[PDB]
Amino acid sequence: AVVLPDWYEEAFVNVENLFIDMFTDLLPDYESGCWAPDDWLADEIEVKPTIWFFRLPGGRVDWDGRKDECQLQVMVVTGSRDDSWRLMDFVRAMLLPMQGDKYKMADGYTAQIRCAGEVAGPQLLTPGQRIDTRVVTATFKVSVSMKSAKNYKQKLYELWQALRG
């Protein structure tokens, strides 16, 4: 994949990954992800429920404050409008009351959701080509603490003081 430097460790959590793990633990059978899988698109008449999490441009990161704010868009896709609204209600009831809540992702790292507020309320979008799926989307402003605010200024200075200096 990507060969990052040996001295670099992750500083931010993946909000999409964190919530994908959370909602695969909460809803085991229903599949959640950041993408529309090719095999999920194969069936439309009898469509399996799914939840999509997309990170969006929103909120200001605070490196000094060890905070990582982002706008998360949740797309609930089911075969019925009532089912979509029920699943969106479940998602809202899970995300909204969060305040300093810890969650251990599949990676084994325990994150911490500082807060989760709603920017744009839920709404049923008009159908596109996929006509039998009723989708309900809502955007949330999610703030999660960073893994570490440690800076790598030492390595940056060493680089150009060894090559150019």
Partner: protein, 299 residues
């Protein structure tokens, strides 16, 4: 040298209380000296402290400070000589949401313990004729978690009292919010009016960097060469307590590996139950530092 080293910014000593909780207790209880369990090093709030419930997220507590400076000038100098401070008052306010007994008792400065609900669960809370002087013991606990090791940052104000109360707007889009401004006084028993504190495994990691106590340089395990019995006797099991020169017990943090598990097996908790009669070397595995020990087994 390079300039960034002069600042020496850790960037990990910025603890943010992510779930701040206020715990009020009656003046009859014993004030909390610390929130660290002596036996486990975990958060142990003493009994008698009852939380005031959830408050407003966006506002939060505003822990205020006031200083009374009296720069005594005797005979005329270009700068004051012996500038002293008279009073330091610590105040904090929060917009409570819960309609609990303690919240309304604090707001109305009365003791509603004798308030008996009617046969249909109806209570009326009359305001006192004269506002009573009721003192409380307050704790403001916040938890910041690094990985899975939390930092319990807290304050210990043992003689708080309600000073003022904000006006309440009763609309349809907002719930009733009580916003008292508690003022912290100096208790004559414990001798302090406020005490900031830190605890937790995260603070065990950050304490040496913060500057409290000696630096973490060496680690030792107290039993030089313990002996345990193969049979289920009294000495069947033993305990390993790795402790650095800082004086802090690092047993939960340090994982021990045994070179010869066949003779003696030691888990991450330093269990010395043993397997077979023999001598095995136990190496306390940590990061930048490491420790070594030897454990013998004999029935």
């Amino acid at each position: 040298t390079d300039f960034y080293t002069i600042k020496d910014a850790q960037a990990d000593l910025a603890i943010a209380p992510l779930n701040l909780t206020v715990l009020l207790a009656p003046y009859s209880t014993t004030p909390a000296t610390t929130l660290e369990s002596p036996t486990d090093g975990s958060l142990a709030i003493p009994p008698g402290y009852k939380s005031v419930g959830h408050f407003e997220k966006q506002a939060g507590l505003t822990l205020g400070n006031e200083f009374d400076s009296k720069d005594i000038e005797a005979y005329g100098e270009p700068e004051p000589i012996r500038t002293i401070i008279n009073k330091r008052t610590t105040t904090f306010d929060f917009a409570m949401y819960q309609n609990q007994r303690n919240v309304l008792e604090l707001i109305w400065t009365q003791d509603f313990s004798n308030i008996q609900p009617s046969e249909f669960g109806g209570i009326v809370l009359e305001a006192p004729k004269v506002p009573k002087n009721i003192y409380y013991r307050a704790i403001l606990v916040g938890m910041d978690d690094r990985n899975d090791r939390p930092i319990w940052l807290y304050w210990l104000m043992p003689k708080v009292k309600l000073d003022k109360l904000d006006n309440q707007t009763l609309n349809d889009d907002n719930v009733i919010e009580y916003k008292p401004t508690l003022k912290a006084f100096r208790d004559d028993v414990v001798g302090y009016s406020v005490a900031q504190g830190f605890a937790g495994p995260g603070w065990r990691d950050l304490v040496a960097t913060a500057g409290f106590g000696e630096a973490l340089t060496a680690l030792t395990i107290t039993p030089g060469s313990p002996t345990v019995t193969v049979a289920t006797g009294a000495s069947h099991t033993a305990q390993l307590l790795v402790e650095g020169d800082n004086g802090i017990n690092y047993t939960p943090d340090v994982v021990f590996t045994s070179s010869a598990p066949d003779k003696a097996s030691v888990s991450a908790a330093g269990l010395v139950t043993g397997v077979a009669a023999g001598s095995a070397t136990i190496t306390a595995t940590k990061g930048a530092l490491t420790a070594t020990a030897t454990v013998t087994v004999t029935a």
